[PDB]
Amino acid sequence: HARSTGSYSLVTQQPLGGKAQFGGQRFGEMEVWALEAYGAAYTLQEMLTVKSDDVNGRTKMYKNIVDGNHQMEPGMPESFNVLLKEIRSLGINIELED
Amino acid sequence: SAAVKEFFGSSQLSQFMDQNNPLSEITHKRRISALGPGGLTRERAGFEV
Amino acid sequence: EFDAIKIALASPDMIRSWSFGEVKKPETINYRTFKPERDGLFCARIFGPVKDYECLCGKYKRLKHRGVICEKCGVEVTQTKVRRERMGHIELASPTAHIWFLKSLPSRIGLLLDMPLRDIERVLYFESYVVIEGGMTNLERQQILTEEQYLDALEEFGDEFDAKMGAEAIQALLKSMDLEQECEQLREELNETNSETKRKKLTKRIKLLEAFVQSGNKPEWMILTVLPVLPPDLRPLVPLDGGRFATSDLNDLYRRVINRNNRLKRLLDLAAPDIIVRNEKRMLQEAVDALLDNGRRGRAITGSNKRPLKSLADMIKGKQGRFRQNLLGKRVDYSGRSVITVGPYLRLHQCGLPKKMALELFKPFIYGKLELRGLATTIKAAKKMVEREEAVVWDILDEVIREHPVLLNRAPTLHRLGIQAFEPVLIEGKAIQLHPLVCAAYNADFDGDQMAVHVPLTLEAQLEARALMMSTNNILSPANGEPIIVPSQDVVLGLYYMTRDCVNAKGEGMVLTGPKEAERLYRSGLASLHARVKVRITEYEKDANGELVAKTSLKDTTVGRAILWMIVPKGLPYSIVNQALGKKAISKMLNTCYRILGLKPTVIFADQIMYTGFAYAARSGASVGIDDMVIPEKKHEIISEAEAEVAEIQEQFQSGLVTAGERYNKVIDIWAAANDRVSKAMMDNLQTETVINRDGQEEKQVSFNSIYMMADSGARGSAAQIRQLAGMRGLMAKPDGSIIETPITANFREGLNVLQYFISTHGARKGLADTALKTANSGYLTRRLVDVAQDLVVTEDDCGTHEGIMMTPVIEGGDVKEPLRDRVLGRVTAEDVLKPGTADILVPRNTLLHEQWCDLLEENSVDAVKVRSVVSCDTDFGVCAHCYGRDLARGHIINKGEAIGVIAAQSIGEPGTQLTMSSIQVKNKGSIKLSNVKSVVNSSGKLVITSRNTELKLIDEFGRTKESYKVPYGAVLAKGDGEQVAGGETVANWDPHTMPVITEVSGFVRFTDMIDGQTITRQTDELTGLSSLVVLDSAERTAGGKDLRPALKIVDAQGNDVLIPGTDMPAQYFLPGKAIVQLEDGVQISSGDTLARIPQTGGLPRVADLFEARRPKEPAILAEISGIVSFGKETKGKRRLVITPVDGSDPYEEMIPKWRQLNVFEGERVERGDVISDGPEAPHDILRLRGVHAVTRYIVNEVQDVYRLQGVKINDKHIEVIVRQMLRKATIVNAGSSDFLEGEQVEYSRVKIANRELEANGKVGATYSRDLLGITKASLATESFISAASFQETTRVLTEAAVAGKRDELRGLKENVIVGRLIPAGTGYAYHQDRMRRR
Amino acid sequence: YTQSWKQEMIADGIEASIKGLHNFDETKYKNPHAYITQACFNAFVQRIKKERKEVAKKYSYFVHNVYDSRDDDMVALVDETFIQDIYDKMT
Amino acid sequence: ARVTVQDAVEKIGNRFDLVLVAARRARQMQVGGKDPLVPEENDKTTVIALREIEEGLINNQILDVRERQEQ
DNA sequence: GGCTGCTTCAGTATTTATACTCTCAGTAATAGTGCTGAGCTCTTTA
DNA sequence: TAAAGAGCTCAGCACTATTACTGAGAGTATAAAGATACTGAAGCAGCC
Ligand SMILES: [Mg+2]
Ligand SMILES: [Zn+2]
Ligand SMILES: [Zn+2]
């Protein structure tokens, strides 16, 4: 089973799971470490944002690759913002200083 | 009738007949467990039992 | 983009400041239009456009009409994206007490009013009242009332006296509480108290008060009056995202919550009987409760089907909250998964890959290439072309792969090699081949495993993979410089079958002149393979200055030896190969090859090796059949005699002649005997049956049983496996752990009978369940481990220090385990080294210690070497290189910026997957010596030492210790100190069957205060006869004289107390319960018999509890400070004692559970840290009583030994760095010229640099003591809460940081992942250097 | 059936009795017990019908979305959401 | 025949800088009009970069000062 | 008056059965609605 | 004879008033209807 790109969950735009759905593989914290053991930085970054959630970012990527330009725009995760607002739910005001 | 239909069509002591072998078809009846209502839990599992 | 994240609280003002409106209507949808309601939980009127740029006005179509709000809709005009995030709010009707700040455990509010929790509780649900400024009556601002009390008082005090119930009064109190005055009050009281418990509660409270009054936080804010409501699009009506559909039950609570609110108002709007208004207030409070964190009350509101539903907190915690579910682990695009196969034709740097997955994984690339080529014109054209595989496509794809890497991984990712890179070759198949070497790293069988595969996109990413995760880059296990490319099992059988010799084969012993001829004479079938033969060869060496000078000779070897030898690359001498070449041989060959040659020779070598091994194994025909299992003919013999005897001993017992326990023991031992005997029988018979003439009679060399061939090869299978196959597999366990009386008499050749088989069944089921649980616990273990370091990065080079620890080989008392060669190998030394001959420096000062240096040392009986170590580094935020040394996988000083913590943690956590759950007869020859000595001479005129600290040590003839042994008090030495020793004798021995309580001079003894009945007893000795007026336990003797306990005044013939030799005070000690001097009154004893006589886990959880700084059970009390020992108050519950220095005040006055067995008598002056009692080591105390390197070395040795017990290997630097983290907070003990308090704690390195600044000025900063916290402790007390929140227990740490109002500077990894930037790990380290340098 | 509902049910009934106490003759209907009894009874049935058809509405919205991503749909479940969403609608 | 960065690190004894400079060079040649300094035989752009690195003529110093004379 | 042992709790690893009666209420769909034009209607006399 | 007026009324987009119609509300007066395991931490509890 493969997945170039397909749907995404909606509450969080992470590519859906399972094989019935055109789901992407499970990429885990253990792997996260196994990657940090190497100085495998860009790998991990473009892994967990540009191919997972950075919607603006992933669109820009898809374009640049399908038009001959391997280059990444970092952006900033989305489901993270979900957590941000989720803690904004309770009165614990959270903020992102300058 | 509501409760009966529920029980049959819905109870963790009921599953599709494992049906791909005259063997498995018979293994899936001479089988006994202690799960569900009146039994321990898959992660409540005590070593002894 | 943006710097540090900050947390704080929010006045309901700011809640208003957020929301784009306020929601009141409890419902959502029209069920006909399916549109939002007019003013409801989803309504556009606040949240916004359900489409983009137009709403139910239909009034605004293009960018000309965007933006400006409608009047029919009322809603602004924009894209629906913003609806996802806009927040709302409810206005509360009655105030609400927040639950988190109520059940912090301990409550950060009850203490804020110093209140017992249950009272604030009963205030909430209104089971009682509460007095707010009781006024001109005897009732107090913190008093509460039973209802009737309130009723009655309020009768006679229906005045300005105030008593209510509910968050009303709490918002009152909090709002009506100033702090600064309160603070100073606490200052005073604290400064005044002598009770420590009060001191602790008060210091915590004053701490929290300084926390609040420190920044702009206002306590009443913990009472809710404005409820913020989540953006609508995150709790959608139904996810509907395929599959079964979820319910997003949040709204429901919300719904019911909002419901009650209006009801409240409505009922207040009716002037309702206040009892029931109370009820509705209660309903509201419980509702908002259940919204915030269900379950913290009595009955968690089950959703349905008997399931609890999900609050705002459940989205957060567990292995399914945002953190452990989608912030860290995340399914990713451009990935695939399949089954695996071998494909041995592949070389090292490449992997097979099916056509299909290959096609999808690169669709964008293919599109780009086609449209660059013009073969298609639009994207749709390309989609169609790719659909039905217009046969051009393939070559297109071919070009795309040309060197495009891929990344492979397995499911349970243990360590740094579980995920690697490859360069695929395209297969018209469906499965994945695999270079059959790497399969070890993947711990992977080929029985249905499933591998996963991902693809780098950016050129930078391809580069990262290329240089850093390619199989051509990962050959030395990061756990230990072992080559990790071990040719596993069948190449092994091949090679072994090749390098070997038959007694007489075809054309054996002829002469040849080139391995070419060897090959030919083999294939031509004119010469056998394993046959002795003289052959001319040559060989090389770059022993000279790089130049691999070659040189010939003639050897006598076997053919295949040479055949292989044609492959061995340049710089190798032949004798490396002349052996028979089992497995570890090829291992060490690989290693030395890598060490002397570099890298590419090694990989080419290994590849060729696999090729040749597979080929020759193939040629071999190494089958196996019913005749591979030889049988001990005398099996039945040993068994028949064993059972004959056991029948006898059993009928002996059954006749009543012995005890059942020892009879069982005898049965155990006899079955063990027969077991080992038949083992010897078989194994020997098998291993040698070569009997074949050599033109003469015969000779007997290593036989050729395929089974035996494997075993001696060590390719696969345990000798015990054979043992089971042929020999009877002895006895098995018991559900308990007992053992069945009769053993398994049978083998597997013959068949088991029912019962034996049954028993084996039980044992196997046991082992399997243990496998399950073991994997389980190892999981959470490695979790904590990786989590505890998570941030340690090589920040520098050389911390500028010449300390460290003096490492030495380990001696378990008997044999030594690690030669000094190892602890040193690759660990930069601070000081240089001397020779045993004085002034003979050997190594330079601070040099890196590679292998030729290990040689130069090892030849010189090097003793013990100081070396840099991580615990000792002189740097903040990381560790200097030389304190760390070599990369353990790259034979050079580790570069600058790796994440050492994570590699250490993975290494350590991996092997848990498989882990489990007197006399001195020296044997060697040399010199005897001792340490911590105090001895005595007898009429025997020999040495008998008089301490429990004496340390025997056997020094060899070289200069390096071979043995040492702790030998207890009262042990007679046949020899002395400074003699010769041999094997087979004991030099000293004692009696552990008593307690030596000797005094060491000849004189007179007494029954001084030893009056029977009160503290001692009369003993008409029924064993000998001597009327030993024997001592019992005074505390179990009479209750009046149990204080005047039996002293033993050592006196002479003069009767005067003989002042101890040299000393001016004699030995006036005690004979406690059952401490007997059988020798009578006034007897003149000579030294040589004790005065008083008193005849006297480890698996993985051991490591687990160890790292958690867990509890020793019955710790052994050490010496806080020197001095002598005294006895005062007694049985204030327990025994007591006091200790006095030689110069300072007696500071130590401690009680003891009377059970304890002392270690040193009163009069002795001991040194600090001497173990004044018996038992284990109390790690915290080990630290504060022993410094650092003590406890470090300790832990190191324990874990290393628990591993050693299982053959596994881990370099110590990992354990080093783990401990290095383990202590990071120090407790100040004198504020000094610094500012902080005295009884608190601060980050060690932070206060350290604080001193570095301070102590640049004569004003001496704060004195302190480094501390010890277990991993689970230090995981929390970090500069970061986000990383903490990633760890367990979100709730308390989170509300805590919020109350505090912290701010996180993002200095670390587990946080630079969340924001998703370049972690300062590899490349990212460089960029972070840069980005800091900018500002 | 359900504790959570039952809470709101009783809430309803209580308010209903509260307001409805306003008018209770004595000369006739010599008992207030049954008065409040049937009052709350009706309040309850009102609440429950509201909630039933609410979640019904939820079902209805659901069944009108089968066009999610690709092929391989399901037949078993959908019929049951349908059949309930019909049964409830019968009323 | 570019499989090992062994000598790529013999120049830059860093094994990390490698990625950086190779990435700059690749971004240059792939999209930007920077021509290989080394005879190319259908080897991908990053492989070209690594080639140019492993011959002692491209580094931080040389490529940066090329960019400087460019400015 | 400060002082140690028990202790209790808290943190880890599909799909819910029985009103009634107005009574109103104001709403959203919905036919009534009237244009524009335009296209055919019609005659004109050149 | 046939190009060219001036009007007779029929497609084709609204509009206001409408009409089921669904919702909100207000009346309701028989009853008594349960098989982890562990570690830890403050609070409670008895003591010289
Ligand atoms: Mg497997
Ligand atoms: Zn509108
Ligand atoms: Zn250092």
Side-chain angles (χ1 to χ4, degrees), chain C residues 410 443-450:
Chain C
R410 203 164 181 275
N443 184 13
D445 50 347
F446 272 114
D447 269 322
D449 287 2
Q450 301 191 181

Side-chain angles (χ1 to χ4, degrees), chain B residues 16-30:
Chain B
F16 301 110
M17 184 155 185
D18 174 18
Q19 185 211 34
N20 57 336
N21 277 318
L23 177 148
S24 64
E25 285 174 355
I26 212 169
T27 201
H28 201 276
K29 336 196 187 214
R30 282 170 79 92

Side-chain angles (χ1 to χ4, degrees), chain E residues 5 7 13 15 26 28 39 41 44 51 58-59 64 67 71:
Chain E
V5 284
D7 309 67
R15 212 156 177 99
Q28 288 173 339
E41 295 74 29
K44 289 172 166 301
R51 295 170 76 171
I58 294 299
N59 69 345
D64 284 34
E67 184 59 298
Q71 189 270 334

